[PDB]
Subunit: 79 residues, 4 copies
């Protein structure tokens, strides 16, 4: 990545690794180490993502929002 | 929300997302992205919430306290 | 307790809530909100505690050590 | 260890306790308190490690990389 990784990673049911970074991105990485996708938030992602029963990834960001992201990398909703 | 989100989200038995924020509040969000309730502490909430077997949500705050909150949103006890 | 609580709490099998604080103490609290015991480290405890299979409570401190503490509240070892 | 321990410990399938430290190392410590191995990253390890189903340890570092480490303490890949 291009920023310090303060978020603690979470592992999806299929092995996908989700982690936030200081470059405003929540990352999704395959077990082989290559990028599944990346989601742009407004600020540093110090929150550690949590994975729902249906696969939704929830993580907070420094831009005041709690994000919900579908497993394909596009936004479900933000609070 | 109106504060930086450092707490990492915790997901309840029914899918309720709990996360703290710098605006002194512990938020509770429904899986559809709408507020269920919010509880106010006396400082920033950087601890990440932990959920018990009976649904109690535990979380710390900068105001020296450890909070226990029932799933309704009202205080159980503080330490 | 007394001090900013950055440690995210962990929940034991019997419902005991373990959390660290800046007062150099690791805290074990019963589900009712009363103190069970406290263990003193050499620095602030920002690490969130993790619980082993036999009940051992692992947590780190700013005094460079990782602490292993028995469920009764006494030192198992420190690294 | 050599630096402050902010990473939260994670427990493997065989009871191994994994934790990061500000000395740029990810530690693997047996339940008996003896060192199993330590893996050097570029910068401080604030991220709390996560463990996949095959035993891979995922942790973030201040050197911008997300690390995947085999159970034997050797690098699988970095992102």
């Amino acid at each position: 990545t291009g920023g310090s990784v303060h978020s603690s990673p979470a592992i999806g049911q299929d092995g996908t690794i989700y982690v936030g970074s200081n470059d405003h991105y929540l990352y999704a990485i395959n077990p082989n180490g290559k990028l599944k996708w990346k989601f742009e938030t407004g600020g540093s992602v110090h929150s550690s993502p949590a994975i729902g029963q249906d696969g939704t990834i929830y993580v907070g960001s420094n831009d005041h929002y709690l994000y919900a992201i579908n497993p394909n990398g596009k936004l479900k909703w933000k609070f």
